[PDB]
Design a protein around this nucleic acid. Structure first.
Ligand SMILES: COc1c(N2CCN[C@@H](C)C2)c(F)cc2c(=O)c(C(=O)O)cn(C3CC3)c12
Ligand SMILES: COc1c(N2CCN[C@@H](C)C2)c(F)cc2c(=O)c(C(=O)O)cn(C3CC3)c12
Ligand SMILES: [Mg+2]
Ligand SMILES: [Mg+2]
Ligand SMILES: [Mg+2]
Ligand SMILES: [Mg+2]
Lengths: 245, 487, 487, 247
DNA sequence: ACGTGCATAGTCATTCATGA
DNA sequence: TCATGAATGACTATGCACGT
């Protein structure tokens, strides 16, 4: 068990449960989303750490400069674990680290920067499956009489729309289907019922299979060598759609 | 270089500042209860079409439109004012329908302009009802490019309903919010008893407006302060939150606070208790835990020691925290461009007067427009009776001016009416279409007589205010939230 | 809970980000030389009517309109982008007419959004010329509420004229600005010699585009870097400011810098000299004084010591300050959704291709619309020829549908034409108006013949681009600012 | 008497002049960062310095002295003027013999003026007595004639006059662009500020005079003091006749 | 001394590629 | 290390009146 704040980051909205095994840390993109998350969370088991701006690339940046970064310090301090050789998983204050970013490309980018921080400084967190990715909603179907439905893809949107119409439900063509362009646009209720309610949230657990292969990929994509990254993108972007086919 | 004395400069400049702040910034107009920033935001959104019948527009658009046309000030503080009008814990009857993160009753700030969307609420639509029918005076904006309303129709008593707080120069206002249904009863009485004097009117209205009704629910303790505010324009109203004692399996007791008095920051409230316990001020308290959530609302759990009495700790909380705190009522509003402290009957009466003005002006506008339509229709009917000649005339005319000038002489008609004949489509020459013109004339002439009748009968005017308001209250009125108890 | 491998996640996410930045953020479209934010700002202002034929609108309104409809991002950085497009030292041909404080070439920041107004410039109006005549593909915006243009008509070669700088992922662009008149000659040659191969075209275009033309004037030293940039798509162009030696009366020689190379901050430049004289590494300098003003422009006076040679100090300034600095040209642009390094002949050709597309599409749209009106006019003429009959028929109809159906039978007419006859006003039955309908039909049929001719002859299409562009250059073209000198 | 100007121990916001002679030097105290920015550009850097003040100035009449001296904006003014305050006031160390207060023509500019004048009268009174304090009158309108040079107006009356004269003279204005209305210094560019408030051959300055010191002391205390009632009754009493002070 | 609400925005830190 | 330019906003301090 570990004490919760009521010596940690000022931005951290800690949970109430003193058991790390039961605790969760939502690492959130933006002050707005973090604000809404802090309200819609279950304050018993869920803590919120809002991150502001693009995270520093630990692959490119010098070590000392990374340690001066306020956002990195917030993560390292909140997780309770050390870094590199001074890493001690025993001091992990949350056994669930959920990264929650916008569905847009900049959210994807922030994910890669966080995953790079985690893989380089705190790898065991990934290896032991403590790192997760929350999948935010993209659409909210607002039926005239029925309860509203959330969709996490264009396909699901079309499906839920089709099903509802077939079921005799109706939507306004004005209000209609609200499209989310980021977590910052959501209120507390919406975030709870789509990303934080454990009975409905869509989390993805980050697994690490080939460490050596991962090491190389991280260095290529995140490293200082532009040429390697340039050729990699031109080589593999053409086939990004077919990774899971 | 011209010389100017410091006394002249100081006096002139500071008075200019004080007066505009008083009349044109910090204090509400008695008729609609709005400050200039409020009025200009709402009208901007209204004119922009950001209405409940369409999806929320990005709130940046409401701010920018307000800035560009009506309110020559900063986008930041304008956004703040818009945000406030959308918070259910700030306004008893929100005028802005906000979509997104608009903050909390605690220290959680609202999201930035970029993240939020906004539109007018249905009640705000009643603030602006028929504003386009010359129901209120308009004046040129800050650069004369466009017109803005001096006051809104305000088809519900917004000042009393949503209240107002403002710091001016030499004075300040602090009007609490009230229950719409109770205010309606007061208005209904004022309309029926339109001849009743101030003494009777105050008694009647005070009987119907039982006291302020805060959006945060809670409690009002006592009746004197409420009575003082309505009779004097000044009064101290004691508020309380609601506390419910819970027992534990071990047999430990805990206090659960689920409501707080109006304008008490939830986070500051918790911090204050924390800072007083650890400091050794509120003994008997064992533990403070905020079990609040978006689903259970406010829920502050105060576990107390075994050697502690629940009411003793509760009384200590009343004494040393804002769990019990007083609302300093000061009924200050602008009346005819002048700041005035008002009795409750004066607030109701001035509002009723505004409504009657709106209804008479609306009627006047409709009557004028009805006559214009009737005037043109009469012209068209004359053309139809001599349609063979009218068409032959226009055809044989070398120009349209010759055709027009001829029409004036042919049918003994105005130039406006003659122009309408010319603008008439061949569609309207069909049998049934000719008939609609006739019936429309008959239709309008009936409407004109109705309108003339309304203007001639103060009884009907009052009846309209009553009926229209009643419809609004039936539709948008809600239960009382703040409970009133005795000492 | 679904499992995902870190390599899969990393590769997909980073590639998705890189591709969007590359194609949809940092790099210019070759056809109009615009990044998405630019295009969306300009179209927002355009659609909002913020044009030169109207007073400057508050810039907040342009930002909010861009943000609310097209660009789902923050108000701050959008305003930055709008501001930059209005600065004469940033854009060689400004696309935004700014009113107020938009900053300076030094460290003086622009005024905040609230203080400034903005509208489109006449040239920006040429970017958007006839965009409403289906001259460019439109797509739904970020939420499908409205349509936005994929590219602008760009009736002058904007990419080369205003240049572009952008940091993407895996690559970056740095295209310098050019003199519009020189670019026009290049285009004129490309149009005349439309069959010329790349080798000839590159030679011809390089002869007419003598080199970059920076809004900050200054000097270009040498020709190799310019040639490399046009032949390779990459090249290092040596820039210099302008220095004028002045001799005082007491025998005190001083260097007067009146121009600086492109993208050199005036204040940073002065600071750099000062700090290297603090740190003695520019001996010979006696005193540094910034005599700049809004009325004389840039004027930095560098008084040098008596035992110092002016030319020695100037070379020292060339070496150790940005008085001489190189422009790293990298001619990267998006071509058909793909990033590509382009020769100067490719940049011109791709632009000419775009212009021809625009003119052909415009002509097609006009031809379609011409046919529609002609189609309706043919109906009207039939009605006029049998005018006596038309009226009698409409009269006897119980509805307008019976009247219409009859008109079809009477004159052998479409449903569209008969409807147009029905919508016709009695105004047009006057003599001159009947004649006007006749002549209008004759006019359109003449226009249709012209339009058909254009589509059938590539010669005319090229001629249209030439003549229209020439008109633009004659009106909005200016002298060269950057002087080109040899080693 | 001469003093060094900052060039690459004075406020960071201060854009000092080049002339080391206070007799020839001027300090423009400007409302807002935007206006201060434009002034810095349109000024004559030889004799004119700019000190932008941000936000409403602290009321030295109400706030205790220690709090006033901790205020960054007051510190900027005191430091820039070079003189001390109260008993340690030494006019010999005055860095500018012209202290021009330039605020928006709007109501909030008037308020900032009274706050600055209150600071000056209470902390550095001799600056007022010796005529070193001035008030810049910003333009309200800019008439943009189609063919002729643009004209500036400092009142509604002057606008009407210049409009009438020009039209009578055969000049013409567009009904769209037309007459630009200034709502604050922040809306102006560098050139406009020079040609209306900073060009010594065209600027409209008012020199603050101090006749009755005791009367001034009383007025300052009533308007700016902690006593609300006194201020309320003063305003209600004299606001009715503010228009007729110069009739 | 703190809350209130309408008034009077610059500063702060990263990604990303390239050349000094 | 710095500039470039579109991308990812909270914090900071006064006026003003009034009540704990
Ligand atoms: C809070 O993050 C930001 C920062 N900083 C503040 C200090 N901590 C760093 C991590 C981020 C900034 F120094 C500028 C901006 C901006 O300029 C800006 C903008 O919209 O222009 C947006 N953001 C935040 C993350 C989106 C910014
Ligand atoms: C620069 O002055 C301001 C300040 N501060 C910043 C620190 N120094 C103090 C003197 C003023 C502030 F802490 C907030 C605001 C604001 O919140 C604001 C707004 O538009 O809401 C405007 N301004 C400036 C003067 C107009 C503000
Ligand atoms: Mg986002
Ligand atoms: Mg603010
Ligand atoms: Mg920014
Ligand atoms: Mg102002």
């Amino acid at each position: 068990a570990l004490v919760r704040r009521k010596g940690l980051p000022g931005k951290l909205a800690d949970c109430r449960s003193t058991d790390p095994r039961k605790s969760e840390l939502y690492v959130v993109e933006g002050d707005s989303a973090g604000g809404s998350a802090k309200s819609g969370r279950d304050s018993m088991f869920q803590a919120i750490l809002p991150l502001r701006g693009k995270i520093i690339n630990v692959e490119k940046a010098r070590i000392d400069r990374v340690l001066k970064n306020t956002e990195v310090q917030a993560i390292i301090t909140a997780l309770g674990t050390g870094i590199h050789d001074e890493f001690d998983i025993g001091k992990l204050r949350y056994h669930k680290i959920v990264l929650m970013a916008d569905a847009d490309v900049d959210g994807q980018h922030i994910s890669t920067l966080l995953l790079t921080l985690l893989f380089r400084f705190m790898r065991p967190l990934i290896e032991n499956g403590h790192v997760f990715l929350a999948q935010p909603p993209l659409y909210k179907l607002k039926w005239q009489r029925s309860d509203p439905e959330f969709a996490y893809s264009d396909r699901e949107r079309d499906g839920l729309l089709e099903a509802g119409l077939k079921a005799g439900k109706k939507i306004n063509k004005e209000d209609g289907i609200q499209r989310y362009k980021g977590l910052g646009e959501m209120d507390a209720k919406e975030l709870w019922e789509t990303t934080m309610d454990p009975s409905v949230r869509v989390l993805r657990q980050v697994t690490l299979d080939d460490a050596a292969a991962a090491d190389e990929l991280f260095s290529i994509l995140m490293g200082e060598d532009v040429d390697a990254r340039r050729s990699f993108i031109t080589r593999n972007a053409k086939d990004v759609r077919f990774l899971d086919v | 270089i011209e010389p100017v004395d410091i006394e002249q400069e100081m006096q002139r400049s500071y008075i200019d500042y004080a007066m505009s702040v008083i009349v044109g910034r910090a204090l509400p107009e008695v008729r609609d209860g709005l400050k200039p920033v409020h009025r200009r935001v709402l009208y901007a959104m209204f004119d922009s079409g950001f209405r409940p019948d369409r999806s929320h527009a990005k709130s940046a658009r409401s701010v920018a439109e307000t800035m560009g046309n009506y309110h020559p000030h900063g986008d930041a503080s304008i956004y703040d004012s818009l945000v406030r009008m959308a918070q259910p814990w700030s306004l008893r009857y929100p005028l802005v329908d906000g979509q997104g993160n608009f903050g909390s009753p605690g220290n959680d700030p609202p999201a930035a302009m970029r993240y939020t969307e906004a539109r007018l609420t249905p009640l705000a639509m009643e603030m602006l009802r028929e504003i386009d029918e010359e129901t209120v005076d308009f004046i040129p904006n800050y650069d004369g490019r466009v017109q803005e309303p001096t006051v809104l129709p305000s088809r519900f008593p917004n000042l009393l309903a949503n209240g107002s707080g403002g710091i001016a120069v030499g004075m300040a206002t602090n009007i609490p919010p009230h229950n719409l249904r109770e205010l309606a009863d007061a208005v209904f009485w004022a309309l029926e008893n339109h001849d009743a004097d101030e003494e009777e009117t105050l008694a009647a209205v005070m009987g119907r407006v039982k006291g302020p009704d805060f959006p945060t629910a809670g409690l009002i303790v006592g009746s004197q302060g409420t009575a003082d505010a309505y009779k004097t324009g000044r009064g101290s109203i004691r508020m309380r939150g609601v506390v419910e004692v819970e027992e534990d399996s071990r047999g430990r007791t805990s206090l659960v606070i689920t409501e707080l008095p109006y304008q008490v920051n939830h986070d500051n409230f918790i911090t204050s208790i924390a800072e007083q316990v650890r400091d050794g001020k509120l003994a008997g308290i064992s533990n403070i835990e905020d079990q609040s959530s978006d689903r259970v609302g406010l829920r502050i759990v105060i576990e107390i020691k075994r050697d502690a009495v629940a009411k003793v700790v509760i009384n200590n909380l009343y004494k040393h925290t804002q769990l019990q705190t007083s609302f300093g009522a000061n009924m200050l509003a602008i009346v005819d461009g002048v700041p005035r402290t008002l009795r409750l009957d004066q607030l109701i009466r001035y509002y009723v007067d505004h409504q009657l003005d709106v209804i008479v002006r609306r009627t006047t506008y409709r009557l004028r427009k009805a006559n214009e339509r009737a005037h043109i229709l009469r012209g068209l009917v004359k053309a139809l009776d001599a349609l063979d000649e009218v068409i032959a005339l226009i055809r044989a005319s070398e120009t349209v001016d010759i055709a027009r000038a001829g029409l004036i002489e042919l049918l003994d008609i105005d130039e406006i009416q003659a122009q309408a004949i010319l603008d008439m489509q061949l569609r309207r020459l069909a049998a049934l279409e000719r008939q609609r013109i006739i019936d429309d004339l008959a239709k309008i002439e009936a409407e004109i007589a109705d309108l003339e009748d309304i203007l001639a009968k103060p009884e009907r005017q009052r009846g309209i205010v009553r009926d229209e308001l009643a419809e609004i209250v039936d539709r948008h009125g809600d239960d009382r939230r703040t409970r009133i108890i005795a000492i």
